[PDB]
Design a protein around this ligand. Sequence first.
Ligand SMILES: OC[C@H]1O[C@H](O[C@H]2O[C@H](CO)[C@@H](O)[C@H](O)[C@H]2O)[C@H](O)[C@@H](O)[C@@H]1O
Lengths: 62, 62, 62, 62
Amino acid sequence: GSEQTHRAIFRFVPRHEDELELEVDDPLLVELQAEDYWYEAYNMRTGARGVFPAYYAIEVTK
Amino acid sequence: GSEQTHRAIFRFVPRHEDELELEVDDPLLVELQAEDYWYEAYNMRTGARGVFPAYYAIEVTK
Amino acid sequence: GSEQTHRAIFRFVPRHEDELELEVDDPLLVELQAEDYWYEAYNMRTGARGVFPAYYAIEVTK
Amino acid sequence: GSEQTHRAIFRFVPRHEDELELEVDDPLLVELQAEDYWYEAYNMRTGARGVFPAYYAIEVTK
Ligand SMILES: OC[C@H]1O[C@H](O[C@H]2O[C@H](CO)[C@@H](O)[C@H](O)[C@H]2O)[C@H](O)[C@@H](O)[C@@H]1O
């Protein structure tokens, strides 16, 4: 979809090229699964895309 | 020191060469706690060295 | 239904008799999503049925 | 009373006697981090005491 799917809960500052920087409460759009325990997403606040540790975000209320 | 400082609470599978693999409850000797929220540590179970997202581990208690 | 509906993302060790024990990645068949934010499900790995805090599992990515 | 140790990230409505009700963002003073992944704590907003699933809260003051 095009709507927010997750919200970051921990600050994440990249050290690697493919990573997505996160600020607490950052809205995230995740569209694929993980397996690696890493999520690939679009940060709706910064407009950047990349991966981050899966447990650094929570699915938006259901 | 050389005693456990933290315990992993989330599974972490390295995606990058410098990362440290973690399994929940792994005893960790955290040596570096960096400004960018990445921690450098020795995994006391596996014997490996590497970095991982800071919030994947919590300090030991008691 | 007879195919996985949700995936457990945190380990959950029951403290009460009606709870369903969970291990990360456990394939769950959620049969009821209660209004008090607890899910009733069948654990496809253990063959047991029980309840657990709703946020311990996420819907599978179709 | 000591200082806040954790913050609730998920809504938790008790179904059992000994449980502590949580609202997202509730300040928590965790007195015991049990080995069965349940936390015994004081809810600094409601003033209540009880247990809750460990992964429903995150540590503060990293
Ligand atoms: O293994 C996935 C299926 O698990 C259940 O069904 C099986 O488990 C039953 C008892 O719990 C057995 O009697 C049956 O023979 C097993 O195949 C579930 O009911 C199915 O819907 C799942 O696909």
